[PDB]
Nucleic acid binder design. Structure first.
Ligand SMILES: Nc1ncnc2c1ncn2[C@@H]1O[C@H](COP(=O)(O)OP(=O)(O)NP(=O)(O)O)[C@@H](O)[C@H]1O
Ligand SMILES: [Zn+2]
Length: 682
RNA sequence: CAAGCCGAGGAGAG
RNA sequence: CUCUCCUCGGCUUG
């Protein structure tokens, strides 16, 4: 391993105690300086006949294996014992034991917290911090309100104050936080920015920050920025299509007699639709809820029209209504006035909308703008042409990847592309899998795919190859994502683009984040130069406040919903105001999943085979006689006992009918019994 | 590989 | 404070 000049000075105080933060720019060899500090710490503790164990904490899964392979092991294999843990191994099981070996640990975080609370909650073996001598951390800036990793530090600080009260002593470990930039936490003033920085430092018990200042030219030579750049467009033609939908929506409303006091093709209208649907369901009146459920889809279509072709929205709707018709046919294998009206309204115009949509006279501006942007680069760079795109949603990524596959020009210049999204199981999309992710990464590094379409998945963690033409298509989250994307584009003649519309404040937000970036550095300078006694005073104050801010939160959130009422309810279908179950019939398996195993509920529903699995069905999706999907099948002990949700059902209390929607099971107070085969058997 | 439970953070709009 | 979008982590059934 090698020791750079400017990494030296930033590392220097850490080498003799002095828990600190380190914020350097991106790509400056953050991991490597980490590694060096490790080796020093361990060699030191050996030379003093003192036990030395380091643990690394990360926030994602992949970074653990990542760093295990590339940085720590290749250099420290010979002197020491290393290991890499995560939720994707089998070494989680005896975590207290691996500590008894493996002086170097890498780990996903919540592993640790789980073990601590097992030591402090059950009679399990567990572990305490005393068994360490260092904690190295990545991505400092997640240390905020009740994240994971702040439990850890709140406990560290609790024990530190125990030590301090003792002094007026357990040897606490050293801490070393590493980041790119800690970031201003939503503050409108330089002073509150400062306050936030100090809040971080108190949550890390730091002594400084140690930005690089002295050996700065070596950085500028070795490391450089891209060039910021904007591209803007405007649209007032909306020629055939938009109005063609607004007509429909207006017709539905004037069938429903509901006044939005709002506009078509925005987000407040959506919120209204939601609460209206919820109200209609808590009351039970159809004709309003179901129309709302459709209007939401129409609004979504319009929103994506603002960014994406008409064809994609038409397809979105086609999928929706095709599904609904298939549902009604599987059930009927009756036709209420509502659904009949809605379908008759839609399908008559289906062919029209298909014609209107395919119309290259007025496709979209931003797509053309990025056409120009992209072609410029891939003509300039010629086979060293790595690319990245960022957007907001998943569907957008699929659409763009599809298009770039379709249009010939992109394929002509060698614009090989692939999409990328996150693995969360929610949000009406089939997510990806970690394997797919890693493979795409390796293809990019290989060069199979020249450019990637991504959500916010890329602006952290996983290690993409350096790039040229990072852009930004309808997304401005905050300064952190801004800088982290800004730190990708090496390979000179790099850029950082933003593509937006005119009448949607985004460039606004871009500038705000730019100012925030310029602000935080000022604050850093304010604090680095702060006097040590004053600094100490303030961090002590903040640590106290943080710990007291814990206790209170503890005193008001013990249970907050504890009234266990077994069968005091009735679950109805939310589309059709129809009984489905009572609370007694339901049971739980593994104290997590809810399920019912009475033949009454058995006969009520229908199974529609899966589309996720065709991409032999195993987990069937349940539907009603109305058509409302309810749940999913399940295989427990071979019993195909069908699970369900509480997002599609409505509750009715027996007393006075405040019917409520809950969106998940933990929110409600009442408890359900565990499953046992004594019922239905013996 | 599919299904689901819980928790956390960020952003928008209200 | 609520809704939506986005990401992440831990954990179970198969
Ligand atoms: N001290 C060093 N000496 C030699 N090469 C280094 C050093 N630090 C980093 N590198 C090289 O830089 C690459 C890895 O470092 P880097 O690009 O900073 O990844 P990183 O630690 O993830 N930076 P970041 O993305 O900001 O977290 C490899 O090509 C290394 O060879
Ligand atoms: Zn129904």
């Amino acid at each position: 391993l090698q020791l750079r000049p400017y990494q030296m000075e930033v590392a220097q105080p850490a080498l003799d105690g002095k828990n600190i933060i380190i914020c350097l720019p991106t790509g400056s060899g953050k991991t490597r300086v980490a590694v060096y500090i490790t080796k020093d710490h361990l060699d030191k503790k050996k030379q003093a006949s003192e036990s030395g164990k380091v643990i690394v904490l990360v926030n994602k899964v992949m970074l653990a294996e990542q760093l295990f392979r590339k940085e720590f092991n290749p250099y420290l294999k010979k002197w020491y014992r290393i290991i890499g843990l995560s939720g994707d191994t089998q070494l989680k099981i005896s975590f207290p034991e691996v500590v008894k070996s493996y002086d170097v640990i890498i780990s996903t975080a919540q592993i640790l917290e789980n073990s601590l609370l097992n030591l402090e909650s059950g009679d399990d073996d567990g572990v305490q911090l005393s068994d360490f001598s260092l904690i190295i951390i990545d991505e400092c800036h997640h240390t905020n309100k009740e994240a994971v990793y702040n439990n850890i530090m709140r406990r560290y600080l609790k024990q530190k104050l125990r030590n301090n009260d003792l002094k007026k002593a357990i040897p606490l470990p050293q801490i070393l936080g590493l980041t790119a930039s800690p970031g201003v936490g939503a503050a409108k003033k330089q002073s509150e920015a400062e306050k936030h920085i100090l809040n971080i430092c108190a949550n890390l018990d730091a002594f400084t920050i140690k930005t690089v200042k002295e050996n700065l030219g070596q950085l500028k030579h070795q490391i450089k920025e891209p060039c910021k750049k904007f591209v803007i467009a405007d649209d007032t033609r909306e020629n055939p299509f938009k109005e063609k939908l607004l007509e429909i929506m207006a017709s539905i409303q004037t069938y429903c007699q509901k006044s939005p006091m709002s506009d078509f093709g925005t987000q407040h209208y959506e919120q209204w639709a939601i609460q209206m649907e919820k109200k209609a369901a808590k009351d039970g009146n159809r004709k309003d809820r179901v129309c709302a459920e459709h209007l939401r889809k129409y609004n979504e279509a319009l929103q994506i029209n603002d960014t994406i072709r008409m064809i994609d929205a038409y397809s979105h709707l086609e999928t929706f209504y095709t599904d609904e018709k298939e549902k009604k046919f599987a059930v009927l294998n009756k036709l209420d006035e509502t659904d009949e009206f809605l379908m008759n309204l839609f399908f008559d115009n289906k062919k029209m909308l298909k014609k209107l949509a395919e119309n290259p006279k007025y496709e979209n501006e931003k797509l053309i703008k990025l056409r120009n942007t992209i072609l410029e680069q891939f003509t300039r760079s010629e086979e060293s042409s790595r690319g990245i795109i960022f957007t907001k949603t998943r569907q957008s990524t699929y659409a763009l990847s599809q298009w770039i596959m379709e249009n010939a020009k992109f394929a002509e210049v060698g614009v090989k592309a692939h999409h990328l999204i996150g693995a969360g199981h929610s949000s009406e999309v089939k997510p990806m899998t970690q394997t797919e992710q890693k493979e795409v990464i390796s293809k990019f590094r290989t060069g199979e795919i020249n450019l990637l379409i991504a959500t916010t998945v890329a602006e952290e963690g996983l290690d993409i190859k350096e790039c040229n033409i990072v852009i930004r298509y309808g997304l401005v989250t905050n300064e952190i994502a801004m800088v982290q994307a800004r730190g990708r584009a090496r390979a000179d003649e790099s850029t950082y683009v933003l593509v937006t519309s005119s009448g949607s404040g985004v460039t606004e937000r871009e500038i705000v984040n730019d100012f925030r970036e310029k602000m935080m550095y000022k604050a850093i300078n304010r604090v680095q130069n702060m006097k040590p006694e004053e600094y100490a005073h303030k961090i002590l104050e903040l640590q106290v406040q943080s710990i007291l801010e814990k206790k209170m939160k503890v005193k008001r959130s013990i249970a907050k919903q504890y009234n266990d009422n077994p069968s005091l309810i009735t679950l109805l279908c939310k589309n059709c105001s129809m009984l489905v179950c009572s609370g007694e019939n339901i049971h739980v398996i593994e104290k997590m999943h809810h399920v019912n195993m009475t033949p009454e509920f058995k006969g009520l529903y229908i199974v529609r085979e899966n589309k996720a699995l065709q991409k032999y069905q195993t987990n069937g999706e349940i539907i009603c006689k109305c058509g409302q999907a309810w749940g999913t099948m399940m295989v427990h002990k071979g019993l195909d006992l069908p699970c369900l949700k509480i997002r599609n059902f409505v509750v009715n209390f027996k007393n006075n009918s405040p019917k409520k929607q809950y969106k998940k099971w933990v929110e409600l107070p009442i408890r359900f019994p565990d499953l046992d085969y004594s019922e239905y058997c013996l």
